[PDB]
Amino acid sequence: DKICLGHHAVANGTIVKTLTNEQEEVTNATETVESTGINRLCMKGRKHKDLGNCHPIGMLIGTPACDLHLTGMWDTLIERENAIAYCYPGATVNVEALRQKIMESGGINKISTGFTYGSSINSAGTTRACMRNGGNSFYAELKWLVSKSKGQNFPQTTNTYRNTDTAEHLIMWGIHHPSSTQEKNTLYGTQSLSISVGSSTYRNNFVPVVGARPQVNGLSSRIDFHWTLVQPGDNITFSHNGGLIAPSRVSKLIGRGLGIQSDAPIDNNCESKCFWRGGSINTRLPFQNLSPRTVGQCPKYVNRRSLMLATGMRNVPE
Amino acid sequence: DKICLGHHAVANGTIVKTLTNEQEEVTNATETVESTGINRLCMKGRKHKDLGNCHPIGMLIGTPACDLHLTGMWDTLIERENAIAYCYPGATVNVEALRQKIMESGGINKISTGFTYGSSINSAGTTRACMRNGGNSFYAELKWLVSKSKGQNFPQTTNTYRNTDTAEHLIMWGIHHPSSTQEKNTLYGTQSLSISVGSSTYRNNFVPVVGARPQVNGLSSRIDFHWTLVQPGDNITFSHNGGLIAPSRVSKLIGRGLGIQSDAPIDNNCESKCFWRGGSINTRLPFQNLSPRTVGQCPKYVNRRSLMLATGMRNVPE
Amino acid sequence: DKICLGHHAVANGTIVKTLTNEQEEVTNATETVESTGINRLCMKGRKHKDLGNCHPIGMLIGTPACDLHLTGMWDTLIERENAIAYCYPGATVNVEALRQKIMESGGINKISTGFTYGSSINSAGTTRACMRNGGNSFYAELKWLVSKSKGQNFPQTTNTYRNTDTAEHLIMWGIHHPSSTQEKNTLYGTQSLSISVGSSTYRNNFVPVVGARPQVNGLSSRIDFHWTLVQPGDNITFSHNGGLIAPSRVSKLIGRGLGIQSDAPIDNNCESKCFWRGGSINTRLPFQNLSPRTVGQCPKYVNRRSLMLATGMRNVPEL
Amino acid sequence: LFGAIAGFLENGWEGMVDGWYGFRHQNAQGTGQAADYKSTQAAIDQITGKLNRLVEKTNTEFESIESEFSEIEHQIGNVINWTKDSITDIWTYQAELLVAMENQHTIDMADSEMLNLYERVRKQLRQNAEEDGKGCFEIYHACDDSCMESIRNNTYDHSQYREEALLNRLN
Amino acid sequence: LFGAIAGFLENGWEGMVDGWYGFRHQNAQGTQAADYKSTQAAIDQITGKLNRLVEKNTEFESIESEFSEIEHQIGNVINWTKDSITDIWTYQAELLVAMENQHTIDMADSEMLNLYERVRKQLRQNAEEDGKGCFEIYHACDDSCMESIRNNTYDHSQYREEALLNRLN
Amino acid sequence: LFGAIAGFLENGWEGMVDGWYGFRHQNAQGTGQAADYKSTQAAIDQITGKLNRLVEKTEFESIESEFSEIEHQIGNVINWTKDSITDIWTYQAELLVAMENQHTIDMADSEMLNLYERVRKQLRQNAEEDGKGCFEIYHACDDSCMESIRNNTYDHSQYREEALLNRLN
Ligand SMILES: *[C@@H]1O[C@H](CO)[C@@H](O[C@@H]2O[C@H](CO)[C@@H](O[C@@H]3O[C@H](CO[C@H]4O[C@H](CO)[C@@H](O)[C@H](O)[C@@H]4O)[C@@H](O)[C@H](O)[C@@H]3O)[C@H](O)[C@H]2NC(C)=O)[C@H](O)[C@H]1NC(C)=O
Ligand SMILES: *[C@@H]1O[C@H](CO)[C@@H](O[C@@H]2O[C@H](CO)[C@@H](O)[C@H](O)[C@H]2NC(C)=O)[C@H](O)[C@H]1NC(C)=O
Ligand SMILES: *[C@@H]1O[C@H](CO)[C@@H](O)[C@H](O)[C@H]1NC(C)=O
Numbered sequence A, B: 001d002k003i004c005l006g007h008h009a010v011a012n013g014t015i016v017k018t019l020t021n022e023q024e025e026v027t028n029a030t031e032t033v034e035s036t037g038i039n040r041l042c043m044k045g046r047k048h049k050d051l052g053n054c055h056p057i058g059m060l061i062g063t064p065a066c067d068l069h070l071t072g073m074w075d076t077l078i079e080r081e082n083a084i085a086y087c088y089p090g091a092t093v094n095v096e097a098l099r100q101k102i103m104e105s106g107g108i109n110k111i112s113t114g115f116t117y118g119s120s121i122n123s124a125g126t127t128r129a130c131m132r133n134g135g136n137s138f139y140a141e142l143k144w145l146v147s148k149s150k151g152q153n154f155p156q157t158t159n160t161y162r163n164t165d166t167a168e169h170l171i172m173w174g175i176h177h178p179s180s181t182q183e184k185n186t187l188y189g190t191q192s193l194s195i196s197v198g199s200s201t202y203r204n205n206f207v208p209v210v211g212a213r214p215q216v217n218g219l220s221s222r223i224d225f226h227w228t229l230v231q232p233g234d235n236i237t238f239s240h241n242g243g244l245i246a247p248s249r250v251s252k253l254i255g256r257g258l259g260i261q262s263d264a265p266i267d268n269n270c271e272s273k274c275f276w277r278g279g280s281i282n283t284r285l286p287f288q289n290l291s292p293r294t295v296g297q298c299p300k301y302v303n304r305r306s307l308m309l310a311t312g313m314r315n316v317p318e
Numbered sequence C: 001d002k003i004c005l006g007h008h009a010v011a012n013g014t015i016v017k018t019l020t021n022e023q024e025e026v027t028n029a030t031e032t033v034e035s036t037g038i039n040r041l042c043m044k045g046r047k048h049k050d051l052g053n054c055h056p057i058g059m060l061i062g063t064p065a066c067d068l069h070l071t072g073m074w075d076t077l078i079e080r081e082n083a084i085a086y087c088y089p090g091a092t093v094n095v096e097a098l099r100q101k102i103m104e105s106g107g108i109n110k111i112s113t114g115f116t117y118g119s120s121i122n123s124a125g126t127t128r129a130c131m132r133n134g135g136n137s138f139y140a141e142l143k144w145l146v147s148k149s150k151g152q153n154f155p156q157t158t159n160t161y162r163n164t165d166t167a168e169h170l171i172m173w174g175i176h177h178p179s180s181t182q183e184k185n186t187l188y189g190t191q192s193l194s195i196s197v198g199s200s201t202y203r204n205n206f207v208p209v210v211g212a213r214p215q216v217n218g219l220s221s222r223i224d225f226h227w228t229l230v231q232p233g234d235n236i237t238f239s240h241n242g243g244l245i246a247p248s249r250v251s252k253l254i255g256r257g258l259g260i261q262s263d264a265p266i267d268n269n270c271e272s273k274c275f276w277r278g279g280s281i282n283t284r285l286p287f288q289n290l291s292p293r294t295v296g297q298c299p300k301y302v303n304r305r306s307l308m309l310a311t312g313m314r315n316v317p318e319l
Numbered sequence D: 001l002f003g004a005i006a007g008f009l010e011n012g013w014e015g016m017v018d019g020w021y022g023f024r025h026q027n028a029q030g031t032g033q034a035a036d037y038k039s040t041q042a043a044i045d046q047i048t049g050k051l052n053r054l055v056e057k058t059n060t061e062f063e064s065i066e067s068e069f070s071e072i073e074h075q076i077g078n079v080i081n082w083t084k085d086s087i088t089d090i091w092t093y094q095a096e097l098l099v100a101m102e103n104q105h106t107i108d109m110a111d112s113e114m115l116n117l118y119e120r121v122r123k124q125l126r127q128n129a130e131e132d133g134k135g136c137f138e139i140y141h142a143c144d145d146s147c148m149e150s151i152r153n154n155t156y157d158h159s160q161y162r163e164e165a166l167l168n169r170l171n
Numbered sequence E: 001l002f003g004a005i006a007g008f009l010e011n012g013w014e015g016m017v018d019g020w021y022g023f024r025h026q027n028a029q030g031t032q033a034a035d036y037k038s039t040q041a042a043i044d045q046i047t048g049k050l051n052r053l054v055e056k057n058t059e060f061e062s063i064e065s066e067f068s069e070i071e072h073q074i075g076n077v078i079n080w081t082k083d084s085i086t087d088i089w090t091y092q093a094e095l096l097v098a099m100e101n102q103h104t105i106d107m108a109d110s111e112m113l114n115l116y117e118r119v120r121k122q123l124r125q126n127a128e129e130d131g132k133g134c135f136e137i138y139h140a141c142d143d144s145c146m147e148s149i150r151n152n153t154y155d156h157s158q159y160r161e162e163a164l165l166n167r168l169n
Numbered sequence F: 001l002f003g004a005i006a007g008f009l010e011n012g013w014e015g016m017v018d019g020w021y022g023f024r025h026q027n028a029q030g031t032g033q034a035a036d037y038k039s040t041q042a043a044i045d046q047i048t049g050k051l052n053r054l055v056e057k058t059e060f061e062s063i064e065s066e067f068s069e070i071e072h073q074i075g076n077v078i079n080w081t082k083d084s085i086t087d088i089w090t091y092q093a094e095l096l097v098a099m100e101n102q103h104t105i106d107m108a109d110s111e112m113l114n115l116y117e118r119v120r121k122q123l124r125q126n127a128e129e130d131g132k133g134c135f136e137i138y139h140a141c142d143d144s145c146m147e148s149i150r151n152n153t154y155d156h157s158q159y160r161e162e163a164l165l166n167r168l169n
């Protein structure tokens, strides 16, 4: 008469790592590193905006590509690889800082500057480089100011925008840089050009400079874009001679949102809190090996294919 | 006839987490996360400077609010909310880097630049915007240089500061941006204005940005500030034409100290090594959840209310 | 009759820390923090370049100090303390960005710009501040353009560099800042000076500015250097009328390399994957306490002299 | 380590698919097998306790500091690279240690639950059985199917069989 | 887990304020004393852990202004870094107590079992285990004898013949 | 902890030089000592598993110039980040060694106890524990017999009848 104590075993067992052994066999184990991701931006439950080929900067200045994204509300903002910011070629100062501010916002309202110009000014410059409805056009939120009489000196002008709102406003403008002496003369006159801009928190001077350059979108001219934040109650003033690309509206960034740069198409029928370039990560696991670049609420990135956590005893086969 | 082994238990036991059990009851436990901090700045054993409504930048430039803080020694420097840096409209270029230097320092000495000006220069000008006692004053460490004869060209002028010491000196200066072409011509003449500033390491040039006609708009009289370090044995020269707000003294940051931004009342009776916006943390514990923003020798911030460490066995009551 | 069980023990045990006891004697233990490094740069297995007194920036513009370092291939680049970048005194905009790009690289090729100037420009200007063979010279990759007729207006000029390659090129130029009106007028004339530079992806413009300054290598004037990357297939154009220090060659950074700043002598007979200001670290250990600033594949730095890992049982000697 | 699993117990029983630990008996009317539910649930519960902690993580919201589609300034780019790689080195190391540590514990915990079952039966059998060293208990009295069961139940009263058992043991 | 606390010992003793581990009585005259050495062993190991916990630090300065604006891009890098560090420390702190606590509990279990074991081996062939943590002693064991068992001075061979014949009869 | 090393065994054997664990015996032929190879290997193999883990092994580049000025704000961020990374590693390094050492010690303890348990069960009713790690054997056990104990081939049935008689008289 015997009675014997024992444990179970399984025919085929899993190998895991311990402190004292790299090849320990156990009855069972699960993964702790996530390896599979969704190939979709899972936007269900999110007021998301997919920008398409509109670059965030273009929403502020009103590049044609961004006509559907001039104002709106969102809690998630998606930027795409092919995104266009400039139709009229140029560049923006502190552009990455401006992009990040836009990509952290929860929306944009637009507000008129109310700028008006005397009769010696043509405030409606257009160009082939900015087609809007099959016709020559220009940045929606800016006005290209040139002399109404082709070779004459652009008049000394002053324009002031008053932020009468309770939140700060973001105002942008441009400085035209002609590609020839003749072009400068026809647009603004032979006079020396000077453009200065000021608020309680900003003071600066700009001078259009002629220079030969490669054509971009057909033009050898450029615009330098600048921006600043006009505080509540504060006044910003433009004093100018020709060359100013003037704001017709200003921007107000509202609330907060999650910015995402991605390749993946949107799925509005699935939910996620973690995003990367290739889509979404939905997992309960603490670690992931898909990408070191994620935004949102994510498992930590680790340099490991697999990390098995034992869920059973040592497997001791018969 | 027996002998029985056992262990103690307690009427009311404490709950802790283990690898395998949230809610494990133990006879005793102590907290590892400090959740209460002292609401004062504990300054016992620290030679310290409470700056009050003096902003660190105002120390170098000599704003009226900072008159009692133009020099000193300290191992701790305390900055307060809404401290005044400027009395005249304008701002400092590269201000956070400079504020951090001041707030890392162990004291300040001032050294006269020795600058002297010809008879065609008036350097005693003052302004309503910087009141001192009941009268028009100016930044104490600077001088506003204007043409003695109103409307005439401010003379081509050279001033040189020589650092003859064994440590680096911090020199600040200002640039006047007049409110209009008429104010500019009054103060400095009709000539084009240039301020160049050059040492062995540093070169830079400045042109006053003249504003435009209504005084309440964004383009009016302001003074913006600039700074650099002059190394031992190096000289720094100002060549200027009108528009320079020239230093009458330079600064020497001395030693090292701990900088604190807080609105908490100083308490000279208790000691501390860790500070935050609410005043102080005095704990032996390794973690705290009071604030993610602390300076000093601090417990690490964690996003948890409580982490109890068992100090006894499982509690097993009858 | 009896049989007794037991465990070994040793005369001299060593102390380790445990979770519950910081003075636990054990039979044996082993170190986990490395505390000694080699005080040489161990370069065996590496095609390396020691810049000596040549600063990385000077490789791009051709300071005399860098004449033996204008082109090359390397997987390891070594910068020395006090290396010289500039002969003609000046500074570079975003210098540290540029210094790191070079220190990340695995070589530099030089490609000529082919710039030519008309009969009114002197391209061969030299100075007492840059010497070769003990005589006046200038940066090897740049050219100081002045008026051939002293005091007369430098002609409005255009020069264009075309990147016909498959890789981005790094172009550097200078802007001259004279020390007096008199000097400025002699070199470039009385006219207003303007220099604009433009690619498909870069636009900037510059004005020479006159001003009294201390003498550095005997000169009160300065050169500000500027740089940009020119993409393959793109052209960059210089429009100028006095003040441009013009590039005669552009640079191509090639591949990837490890940059090291150290003044430790080089040793070609030992190898290493970890470096710091004074030497190399060869160790199997996961932690080190030599330096918080290391470069390469390195053990993690820890603020401790010693962490003994037990490699045996409690030592229980007979009492 | 506790000495039973991969220890004095030769191997596991692939045929016990009803629990982690159990009994095999041999008496007059044949042999039997039966899993012990308490001990297996102790072990399973402790495992699921670890799995809960593994998934009981909850997340800070991070935003982007690296452009996926545009050049970042070179120096801030290098700082961000150094920081991100340093963070990752820490996590890779935390994940490796976590799992190595947790697995060691899990294995020894299971060994411990085996040993505690074994020890309870021993004390239960008192002076009526002897250990064979390979995990069995040789019972020195007639132990019927309903006796065996009393051993698994914890019903077994040793004093009921003590006289008989001591007799056969001493002879 | 060792066998004893929350195991074959049904429960703890609230009346034992004398120490963590101990003995209870039964003889003619008979009825509790705490064991000093095993209690100390336990407490000592707890205070070792407390010593490591309060072990303390690098000096940190401020890298974000409480009272003014920081540049947007460097501000974001600083935000990302700090939250990353915090996620690490939060994880470490939770791991630290969970793991330390597991070990404290088992360590304590361990000290209980070692005392029990020492008494077992002491009693040799004069006692039998009841499975609830008791030793039923087969000879008369008065207060002085019981003290010799706690005091680790009990001599089994002095009682052994009396004990054996009571055990076997 | 397991109760043997620094426990019910009074001290280690300095003169046991080719094993971590072993046997000392006493019989008519005199005394002797022998190491047990398997238990010492199980202890040793586990240590070298830890050492293997410790020496397993990202390329990093410079982000602060040894030899030139670094901008002040970015420099403070770098100093703050680098110090925060060093605090994490310093903590981890100390926690690693502390945890590892605890476990190595306790592991060694248990390999001693398991050897001790293997021999107990093998001696069955033919020996008795004296509480200090010795088994008092109640029959003659010559050098050949001792080796069968160390061998794990000792057959208790061959001496049982005699052993029981000697334990009771
Ligand atoms: C970068 O610089 C390049 C060189 O200037 C630019 O390519 C140049 O662009 C111009 C105008 O767009 C082209 O000019 C025309 O050339 C034809 C004759 O072409 C044939 O002969 C030339 C000369 O031997 C040969 O190189 C060509 O491959 C053709 O076989 C004339 O009939 C026209 O009147 C006019 O002069 C240049 O040909 C072209 N050069 C090259 C090498 O392509 C380029 O556009 C600049 N890039 C940017 C982005 O601006
Ligand atoms: C700072 O200025 C002083 C004079 O302006 C320079 O010093 C003179 O230096 C020369 C060269 O050694 C000596 O011959 C003179 O005796 C010095 N004069 C005095 C009164 O010091 C000095 O070289 C300048 N420093 C720099 C770096 O330019
Ligand atoms: C294997 O482990 C997983 C993870 O807990 C669990 O779902 C499953 O039941 C285990 N399977 C086996 C073989 O028991």
Ligand SMILES: *[C@@H]1O[C@H](CO)[C@@H](O)[C@H](O)[C@H]1NC(C)=O
Pocket: A162, A200, A233, A234, A235, B216, B217
């Ligand atoms: C802005 O302009 C309005 C209207 O002139 C005026 O009330 C206000 O004082 C100005 N703001 C400032 C700060 O000057």
Ligand SMILES: *[C@@H]1O[C@H](CO)[C@@H](O)[C@H](O)[C@H]1NC(C)=O
Pocket: D074, D077, D078, D081
């Ligand atoms: C930063 O590191 C990533 C990883 O390899 C790489 O894509 C990128 O080019 C590096 N960026 C910089 C600043 O050179």
Ligand SMILES: *[C@@H]1O[C@H](CO)[C@@H](O)[C@H](O)[C@H]1NC(C)=O
Pocket: A104, E071, E072, E073, E074, E075, E076, E079
């Ligand atoms: C950084 O985060 C803080 C805290 O949430 C916030 O107030 C500030 O806006 C953020 N900075 C940036 C760059 O968004």
Ligand SMILES: *[C@@H]1O[C@H](CO)[C@@H](O)[C@H](O)[C@H]1NC(C)=O
Pocket: F071, F072, F073, F075, F076, F079
């Ligand atoms: C950074 O810290 C180091 C090392 O203590 C120091 O020498 C240097 O001053 C510090 N940099 C800044 C920005 O303070």
